[PDB]
mmCIF file of C-alpha atoms and ligand atoms in Angstrom:
data_model
loop_
_atom_site.group_PDB
_atom_site.id
_atom_site.type_symbol
_atom_site.label_atom_id
_atom_site.label_comp_id
_atom_site.label_asym_id
_atom_site.label_seq_id
_atom_site.Cartn_x
_atom_site.Cartn_y
_atom_site.Cartn_z
ATOM 1 C CA UNK A 67 0.000 0.000 0.000
ATOM 2 C CA UNK A 68 1.010 3.627 -0.257
ATOM 3 C CA UNK A 69 0.847 3.699 3.545
ATOM 4 C CA UNK A 70 3.335 0.840 3.896
ATOM 5 C CA UNK A 71 5.534 2.477 1.272
ATOM 6 C CA UNK A 72 5.540 5.627 3.418
ATOM 7 C CA UNK A 73 6.545 3.610 6.497
ATOM 8 C CA UNK A 74 9.467 2.222 4.496
ATOM 9 C CA UNK A 75 10.383 5.741 3.391
ATOM 10 C CA UNK A 76 10.136 6.916 6.997
ATOM 11 C CA UNK A 77 12.565 4.221 8.118
ATOM 12 C CA UNK A 78 15.093 5.278 5.468
ATOM 13 C CA UNK A 79 14.679 8.811 6.791
ATOM 14 C CA UNK A 80 15.408 7.623 10.350
ATOM 15 C CA UNK A 81 18.514 5.796 9.113
ATOM 16 C CA UNK A 82 19.828 9.100 7.796
ATOM 17 C CA UNK A 83 19.073 10.742 11.148
ATOM 18 C CA UNK A 84 21.156 8.068 12.833
ATOM 19 C CA UNK A 85 24.093 8.369 10.439
ATOM 20 C CA UNK A 86 23.892 12.174 10.607
ATOM 21 C CA UNK A 87 24.279 12.171 14.390
ATOM 22 C CA UNK A 88 27.266 9.822 14.161
ATOM 23 C CA UNK A 89 28.706 12.114 11.470
ATOM 24 C CA UNK A 90 28.234 15.169 13.721
ATOM 25 C CA UNK A 91 30.175 13.445 16.508
ATOM 26 C CA UNK A 92 32.963 12.515 14.079
ATOM 27 C CA UNK A 93 33.156 16.111 12.811
ATOM 28 C CA UNK A 94 33.377 17.475 16.332
ATOM 29 C CA UNK A 95 36.167 14.978 17.044
ATOM 30 C CA UNK A 96 38.109 15.896 13.901
ATOM 31 C CA UNK A 97 37.885 12.380 12.385
ATOM 32 C CA UNK A 98 37.673 13.603 8.806
ATOM 33 C CA UNK A 99 38.113 10.137 7.309
ATOM 34 C CA UNK A 100 34.961 9.014 9.097
ATOM 35 C CA UNK A 101 33.125 12.194 8.158
ATOM 36 C CA UNK A 102 33.880 11.658 4.458
ATOM 37 C CA UNK A 103 32.453 8.142 4.605
ATOM 38 C CA UNK A 104 29.352 9.210 6.538
ATOM 39 C CA UNK A 105 28.723 12.012 4.028
ATOM 40 C CA UNK A 106 28.807 9.497 1.158
ATOM 41 C CA UNK A 107 26.435 7.225 3.097
ATOM 42 C CA UNK A 108 24.117 10.197 3.642
ATOM 43 C CA UNK A 109 24.211 11.095 -0.060
ATOM 44 C CA UNK A 110 23.010 7.632 -1.059
ATOM 45 C CA UNK A 111 20.378 7.590 1.699
ATOM 46 C CA UNK A 112 18.948 10.994 0.768
ATOM 47 C CA UNK A 113 18.990 10.030 -2.909
ATOM 48 C CA UNK A 114 16.920 6.932 -2.081
ATOM 49 C CA UNK A 115 14.598 8.804 0.287
ATOM 50 C CA UNK A 116 14.003 11.435 -2.394
ATOM 51 C CA UNK A 117 12.895 8.669 -4.771
ATOM 52 C CA UNK A 118 10.503 6.926 -2.336
ATOM 53 C CA UNK A 119 8.920 10.301 -1.581
ATOM 54 C CA UNK A 120 8.403 11.021 -5.270
ATOM 55 C CA UNK A 121 6.782 7.644 -5.857
ATOM 56 C CA UNK A 122 4.456 8.156 -2.899
ATOM 57 C CA UNK A 123 3.455 11.637 -4.075
ATOM 58 C CA UNK A 124 2.830 10.418 -7.622
ATOM 59 C CA UNK A 125 0.725 7.541 -6.269
ATOM 60 C CA UNK A 126 -1.323 9.832 -4.018
ATOM 61 C CA UNK A 127 -1.981 11.994 -7.097
ATOM 62 C CA UNK A 128 -3.149 9.008 -9.136
ATOM 63 C CA UNK A 129 -5.390 7.969 -6.217
ATOM 64 C CA UNK A 130 -6.913 11.460 -6.046
ATOM 65 C CA UNK A 131 -5.994 11.799 -2.352
ATOM 66 C CA UNK A 132 -6.054 15.577 -2.356
ATOM 67 C CA UNK A 133 -5.107 16.087 1.288
ATOM 68 C CA UNK A 134 -2.161 13.710 1.086
ATOM 69 C CA UNK A 135 -1.017 15.427 -2.127
ATOM 70 C CA UNK A 136 -1.131 18.859 -0.442
ATOM 71 C CA UNK A 137 0.944 17.638 2.515
ATOM 72 C CA UNK A 138 3.411 15.757 0.309
ATOM 73 C CA UNK A 139 3.886 18.798 -1.954
ATOM 74 C CA UNK A 140 4.738 20.843 1.156
ATOM 75 C CA UNK A 141 6.941 18.060 2.524
ATOM 76 C CA UNK A 142 8.965 17.469 -0.648
ATOM 77 C CA UNK A 143 9.558 21.228 -0.885
ATOM 78 C CA UNK A 144 10.951 21.197 2.652
ATOM 79 C CA UNK A 145 12.988 18.088 1.781
ATOM 80 C CA UNK A 146 14.638 20.079 -1.024
ATOM 81 C CA UNK A 147 15.538 22.799 1.484
ATOM 82 C CA UNK A 148 17.310 20.140 3.509
ATOM 83 C CA UNK A 149 18.978 18.737 0.393
ATOM 84 C CA UNK A 150 20.397 22.130 -0.595
ATOM 85 C CA UNK A 151 21.780 22.651 2.914
ATOM 86 C CA UNK A 152 23.295 19.151 2.911
ATOM 87 C CA UNK A 153 24.989 19.748 -0.427
ATOM 88 C CA UNK A 154 26.482 23.062 0.697
ATOM 89 C CA UNK A 155 27.703 21.241 3.815
ATOM 90 C CA UNK A 156 29.475 18.660 1.634
ATOM 91 C CA UNK A 157 31.111 21.509 -0.289
ATOM 92 C CA UNK A 158 32.231 23.136 2.957
ATOM 93 C CA UNK A 159 33.850 19.844 3.946
ATOM 94 C CA UNK A 160 35.639 19.568 0.594
ATOM 95 C CA UNK A 161 36.842 23.161 0.998
ATOM 96 C CA UNK A 162 38.010 22.689 4.599
ATOM 97 C CA UNK A 163 35.636 25.441 5.786
ATOM 98 C CA UNK A 164 34.665 24.206 9.245
ATOM 99 C CA UNK A 165 32.861 27.450 10.043
ATOM 100 C CA UNK A 166 30.496 26.965 7.109
ATOM 101 C CA UNK A 167 30.229 23.231 7.837
ATOM 102 C CA UNK A 168 29.033 24.024 11.375
ATOM 103 C CA UNK A 169 26.501 26.593 10.117
ATOM 104 C CA UNK A 170 25.055 24.206 7.544
ATOM 105 C CA UNK A 171 24.989 21.343 10.078
ATOM 106 C CA UNK A 172 22.816 23.271 12.559
ATOM 107 C CA UNK A 173 20.599 24.643 9.780
ATOM 108 C CA UNK A 174 19.977 21.121 8.470
ATOM 109 C CA UNK A 175 19.066 20.058 12.006
ATOM 110 C CA UNK A 176 16.542 22.896 12.330
ATOM 111 C CA UNK A 177 15.001 22.416 8.874
ATOM 112 C CA UNK A 178 14.624 18.735 9.774
ATOM 113 C CA UNK A 179 13.118 19.159 13.239
ATOM 114 C CA UNK A 180 10.560 21.632 11.866
ATOM 115 C CA UNK A 181 9.399 19.222 9.179
ATOM 116 C CA UNK A 182 8.563 16.454 11.637
ATOM 117 C CA UNK A 183 4.980 17.331 12.537
ATOM 118 C CA UNK A 184 4.191 17.287 8.808
ATOM 119 C CA UNK A 185 5.979 13.948 8.395
ATOM 120 C CA UNK A 186 3.585 12.448 10.939
ATOM 121 C CA UNK A 187 0.589 14.201 9.343
ATOM 122 C CA UNK A 188 1.412 12.512 6.041
ATOM 123 C CA UNK A 189 1.403 9.040 7.590
ATOM 124 C CA UNK A 190 -2.139 9.651 8.826
ATOM 125 C CA UNK A 191 -3.356 11.117 5.534
ATOM 126 C CA UNK A 192 -2.267 8.360 3.138
HETATM 127 N N1 LIG B 708 18.386 14.422 -3.698
HETATM 128 C C1 LIG B 708 18.560 14.767 -2.401
HETATM 129 N N2 LIG B 708 19.634 14.891 -1.675
HETATM 130 C C2 LIG B 708 19.402 15.297 -0.315
HETATM 131 C C3 LIG B 708 20.278 15.510 0.695
HETATM 132 C C4 LIG B 708 19.903 15.888 1.945
HETATM 133 C C5 LIG B 708 18.539 16.057 2.180
HETATM 134 BR BR1 LIG B 708 17.880 16.577 3.916
HETATM 135 C C6 LIG B 708 17.618 15.845 1.203
HETATM 136 C C7 LIG B 708 17.998 15.470 -0.056
HETATM 137 S S1 LIG B 708 17.050 15.149 -1.460
HETATM 138 N N1 LIG B 709 10.411 13.413 10.326
HETATM 139 C C1 LIG B 709 11.160 14.015 9.405
HETATM 140 N N2 LIG B 709 12.055 13.534 8.590
HETATM 141 C C2 LIG B 709 12.664 14.501 7.730
HETATM 142 C C3 LIG B 709 13.628 14.384 6.765
HETATM 143 C C4 LIG B 709 14.093 15.433 6.044
HETATM 144 C C5 LIG B 709 13.545 16.692 6.297
HETATM 145 BR BR1 LIG B 709 14.197 18.185 5.286
HETATM 146 C C6 LIG B 709 12.588 16.883 7.237
HETATM 147 C C7 LIG B 709 12.111 15.836 7.982
HETATM 148 S S1 LIG B 709 10.929 15.830 9.223
#
């Protein structure tokens, strides 16, 4: 079902939360070799999440589930805010700009925490 597909997508999202927190600890500790690997693991996770979310939105549209489509349009837009912040963070790491890396890291945390009440609302709507 689209609802079980969203639960799968939500788990992939939680996996990225877990890896992100590990990556934050590694960054604070200066373990740049770990950070590089965690960033790659986050890129693949977000890429997958982005796809599951698109398939769910397209399916809700085909089903005519107007409320779920509204929420998923708002959610995917917020997801892209997070994706842009993540990508700038990766660039800051490549550039050795720890000040920018820190800024992007906190911003991605805030963008993410805000989008949580909507994440739950989508589960109920599908
Ligand atoms: N294609 C995408 N890459 C990312 C990276 C981080 C976050 Br948050 C969302 C996305 S969507
Ligand atoms: N529960 C939630 N998971 C996510 C993932 C990415 C972004 Br951006 C916001 C949220 S809110």
